[PDB]
Design a protein around this ligand. Structure first.
Ligand SMILES: [Cl-]
Ligand SMILES: [Cl-]
Ligand SMILES: [Cl-]
Lengths: 156, 156, 156
């Protein structure tokens, strides 16, 4: 039963704000959202089996003029895949991606997606979480905002 | 010992539109383009073996001012990795990515690439295709625009 | 003991010029950086065992007005994953990504990341390397700029 997970964002709990925050609302059993041998605790994917896993995340940001105004036109759309654990409580970034975007002008719709992927050694007990800026601009669709992991091979 | 695929764009045709369409011309036996156990049917990567596959797509877009007196003020460069089948035949997006761009500047060259990847459960018979907007802006090189998949493990 | 590598950028040595270059300084022995059954030489990841490998790279560019000014208003922020050989002086592009960005004044901070991935057939003696434009704008953090590979299955 090789470990893996593909979590999709749960808009039914999308926090407001523009500052860097951790996302804790994800789906694990519906649509493309699956999970196995791994446990999820409010946007905190816990590893139960040691191994080399490939981790990835796809976060889509969007804004339509019809939704109203945004604090500032110069945005910083960032995504951070973080690892946390009992021994190491502090957060450490495994991957970082994103871009500054000027969403000014009279344009009606603005969109931008970010993707990151990497190969990492994970020990049971360690947890991966997703931190992003401007969580209010996140796209709610499961094909738009998601993150996952899957074991590729055992640790030597 | 496991199926896989890496298809590269075949600009043999002349897709000159702006609306989102379904790319149907791909290579499977040239350069890096390859395939094993999987079958290609006019832009349709058909799965001939159940199991979990990692899907990925890289789409490059570019534009030159000389191709002028044509709107490239507001652009929506998007990519969609859709899945179809016999049952569950209605098109369902597995992954979405892209960005809005303003390529009306005095710059002689504009470029932007999109990348998406994810871990998915697939059953034999199901198909995977690629849909993008502004297909006439696609970069033809085999290293710029491509998509693919490879089985990571069997379904439990 | 499947072959793999996750290499992180070594800030120390990084071209301060404005030309596109091959990055030749990466870590393989600290932080998330790691390598197994592959050899890092002169910034090139040499394949020591024939097989199909998944290859990836994540490149982050950034700029703070305190660091001075950009070389030009409309920058080309690109990455090329290249394959060369220890036997013949051949050089081929496997993947390409990036985009043109206007980082002219205004904002106090500019950021942009690119990500590429792909399934490739590699043989012993072949080497994977990274070329980027605007190397002086590279983000030196290990979670920011890195590239890697891992064998998924043997050839044939
Ligand atoms: Cl799925
Ligand atoms: Cl290849
Ligand atoms: Cl690691």
């Amino acid at each position: 039963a090789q470990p893996f997970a593909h979590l999709t964002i749960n808009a039914a709990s999308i926090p407001s704000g523009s500052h860097k925050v951790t996302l804790s609302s994800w789906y694990h059993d519906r649509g493309w959202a699956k999970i196995s041998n791994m446990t999820l605790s409010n946007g905190k994917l816990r590893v139960n089996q040691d191994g080399f896993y490939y981790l990835y995340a796809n976060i889509c940001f969007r804004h339509h003029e019809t939704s109203g105004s945004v604090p500032t036109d110069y945005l910083q759309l960032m995504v951070y895949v973080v690892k946390t654990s009992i021994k190491i409580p502090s957060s450490h970034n495994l991957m970082k991606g994103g871009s500054t975007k000027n969403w000014s002008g009279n344009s009606e719709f603005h969109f931008y997606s970010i993707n990151v992927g990497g190969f990492f050694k994970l020990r049971a007990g360690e947890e991966i979480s997703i931190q992003v800026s401007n969580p209010s601009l996140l796209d709610p669709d499961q094909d738009a905002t998601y993150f996952g992991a899957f074991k590729v091979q055992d640790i030597d």
